């Protein structure tokens, strides 16, 4: 139970080096979940000094051995595997090929910054999303989307590569009633507020767009060019919580959260923390931003 | 870079050109600027047999009629 | 010099185990030629068969890396890396299957069927051709050529319909300033030369070339492995076309070199001509006939 809700937030476990704040027997799960929102080599420098700062036989070889394995790492973009490239292994380093070939391969259990209709996703290579530029195949509103994963508590963060001085939006998407609305959220930097939406297929326009009252959402600044942005979400047994905090920003920390929602999830066994199972609402409107996986600070995020 | 210049005029100058024992140049290619010509030094010029006796195992010239029309 | 013969020769050298007989310096120089006549699978397994009877201990594990090492492993399609990726020298398999990703591969050194829009050619994941096969987008293609002074090279017939194939080699003709060529008929019964040009569809100036034996009975059927034998002398090349395991299929002709020629050394590309459309060449190099050890 601790692993699963920790995997939401990847942005957090690792962060400023808090990989080595864990312990022995627990980690092997973190690097198996599948609701990591990392890149792998944010994850792999973060294995790497894991296996460091003890000093590393008997249960040291097949430690390494199982950590490696779990790291996902025979699905990386191939010129990032000469990076790194070790003497060590090759038995579970193993194909870093074949399934990479004939395109038979493990899941990914990465996904975000989804590229469909006027929106592709730039690949570093292998099969990571790393970037969703704005393409036009063809000014306009639309919107762009996620896929589902079963989170208590999430921190999945934004970079910002080139901006035109903001012109953006952010929050999440949540299929909680009878017949499919897909109810989603829908924060900009316009009308001072959460202007919430319906989603009906269609990714080329947003329909239905409501004004919320419950949020404090100021605006000291107006997006400059490489700035990370932290969604965090919150699940609960009668609302979702988001928060869309601008990190080395001493302000920016705009909070709200959603409607009731009608069903609930529980894997049960000593915790009735909900799962939802949201997707997530990223969203790109000029040519411009091209976001995607942020880099993993320096310091620290609320770990201390 | 030069052997791709050279490259692309050699093969397809000489296979469409007339064989080597019906005619004979001097320099394989041809200046433009007129300054150019002036400094080069070397006459540009042909040799031309026309009933150069056939060679054997070379190919020989054919007879090409165009019939009715005559054009 | 021994070596520099038995490179380009290594069709039949590697068809019958006979570069078993070849001591450990001697395959070694002879791998690091750039004429080897095989795919490197069979490359990988003739010297794994090798590695069996003498060698395979840290100093005969770095004699079989230097064996190794010389073989390159980025001509593979993935199937025939995931049935023989022994687990002592995978660090060669992840070097070179990484320029298969970036695309910079080394060079072959073998003769790739070139690609025209008469004989299409597909790959198994390598540089090497699997098969050649007769499409529409006499026609012709040539393989790539070597210097060579005796040279062993050949093709199986996996399918063909009316069985109209003409084997043979080309010559540059340098006296002249040709490109005049030399094949084989069997409707004739006798060799045939002519010349190519840059379009693959035209041989011109067809011409007999009596004084060379022809034994041939019947037209080229599916399952025929075909063997032709080249051997530059001072003055003549022996042009020996066989079919293997077939006593009433083969010919042999004397061709005057028309530029006599280091040790009779001259660059000759691989030559092949069909009609039929859909006929199947595959490119095999004498999978080994083997020596029944008792």
Known sequence: ?304 | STGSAAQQVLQEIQQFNSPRYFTRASVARVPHSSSLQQKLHLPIGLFIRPLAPIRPGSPTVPSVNFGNCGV
């Open chain 1, 1 to 304: 139970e601790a692993i699963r809700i920790l995997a939401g937030c990847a942005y957090a476990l690792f962060s400023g080096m808090r990989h080595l704040e864990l312990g022995p027997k627990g980690l092997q799960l973190l690097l198996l979940q599948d609701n990591i929102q990392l890149d792998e080599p944010q994850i792999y420098i973060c294995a790497n000094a894991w296996l460091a700062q003890q000093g590393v036989p008997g249960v040291q070889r097949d430690m390494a051995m199982a950590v490696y394995r779990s790291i996902r790492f025979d699905s990386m973009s191939p010129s990032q595997i000469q990076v790194c490239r070790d003497p060590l292994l090759d038995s579970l380093l193993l194909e870093a090929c074949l399934r990479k070939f004939s395109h038979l391969e493990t899941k990914p259990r990465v996904f975000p910054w989804q590229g469909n209709d006027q929106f592709t996703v730039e690949r570093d290579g292998g099969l990571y999303p790393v970037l969703l530029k704005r393409t036009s195949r063809s000014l306009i509103w639309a919107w762009t989307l996620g896929d589902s994963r079963l989170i208590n508590e999430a921190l999945w963060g934004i970079e910002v590569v080139r901006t035109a001085k903001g012109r953006l939006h952010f929050g999440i998407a949540v299929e909680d009633k009878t017949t499919q609305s897909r109810q989603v959220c829908y924060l900009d930097p316009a009308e001072k507020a959460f202007v919430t939406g319906t989603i009906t297929n269609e990714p080329t326009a947003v329909s239905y767009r409501t004004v919320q009252p419950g949020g404090d959402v100021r605006w000291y600044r107006r997006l400059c060019d490489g700035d990370i942005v932290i969604v965090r979400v919150s699940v609960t047994t009668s609302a979702i919580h988001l928060s869309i905090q601008v990190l080395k920003s001493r302000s920016m920390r705009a909070s709200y959260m959603l409607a009731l929602r009608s069903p609930v999830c529980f894997p049960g066994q000593l915790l009735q923390r909900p799962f939802l199972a949201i997707w997530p609402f990223i969203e790109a409107v000029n040519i411009g931003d091209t976001l995607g996986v942020a880099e993993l600070q320096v310091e620290a995020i609320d770990i201390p």
